[PDB]
Design a protein around this ligand. Structure first.
Ligand SMILES: *C\C=C(C)/C=C/C=C(C)/C=C/C1=C(C)CCCC1(C)C
Ligand SMILES: [Cl-]
Length: 218
């Protein structure tokens, strides 16, 4: 198994998700459509990013390592969509959406910049993102959860189900970044990539399938 192969698997998984979310969003009421559209964009962007990486593009040499730029472009665009999805589910008002979306962006921009910096100062960027991520988790389990408590029993359950999925799995990315090439480079690129592809598919497509499951029921 090689990087190219892992990237293709990522692209295929994202493509299957995209097609299923677009298809499932065939009917979609005049207000429940925004959810499906977010799911299609999320997995859609990731698919492209992966095909691009698969086609060997965006492999940027930094110091003595490689940085998959497409991966970060993907995250910078898709993570805010996920937050937006949870915000819609939790029923947030513009103000709260703003705070969570900016914290998210700080996390992603910081991780991207840190990866691109060859020197040791890069850990200072990683720290920024990590700190911003804590604030994000705070809003997900506190203020956003409280807000979701105002929605019906089932919507509240879906929100909690997706919230846990997101919080637990997102908390793992930083550890892989730190042990992978960007950090101490303990884990090899292939191992780093294999792990991240699994994580990307679950936090994106699995996340979408759990949502579809809930929708069907209700
Ligand atoms: C494609 C889907 C997802 C959910 C991608 C998520 C990426 C992260 C949660 C990345 C997080 C980072 C953190 C929390 C700390 C600083 C360094 C990272 C950018 C790797
Ligand atoms: Cl990388």
């Amino acid at each position: 198994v090689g990087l190219t192969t892992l990237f293709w698997l990522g692209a295929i998984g994202m493509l299957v998700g995209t097609l299923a979310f677009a298809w499932a969003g065939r009917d979609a009421g005049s207000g429940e459509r925004r959810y499906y559209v977010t799911l299609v964009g999320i997995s859609g962007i990731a698919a492209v990013a992966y095909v691009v990486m698969a086609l060997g593009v965006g492999w940027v040499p930094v110091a003595e390592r490689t940085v998959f730029a497409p991966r970060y472009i993907d995250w910078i665009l898709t993570t805010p969509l996920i937050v937006y999805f949870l915000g819609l589910l939790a029923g947030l008002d513009s103000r709260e959406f703003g705070i969570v979306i900016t914290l998210n962006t700080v996390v992603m921009l910081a991780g991207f910049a840190g990866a691109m910096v060859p020197g040791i100062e890069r850990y200072a960027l990683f720290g920024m993102g990590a700190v911003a991520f804590l604030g994000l988790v705070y809003y997900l389990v506190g203020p956003m959860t409280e807000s979701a408590s105002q929605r019906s029993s089932g919507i509240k359950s879906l929100y909690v189900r997706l919230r846990n999925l997101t919080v637990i799995l997102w908390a793992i990315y930083p550890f892989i970044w730190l042990l992978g090439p960007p950090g101490v480079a303990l884990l090899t690129p292939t191992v780093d990539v294999a792990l991240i592809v699994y994580l990307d598919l679950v936090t994106k497509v699995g996340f979408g399938f759990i949502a579809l499951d809930a929708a069907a029921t209700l």
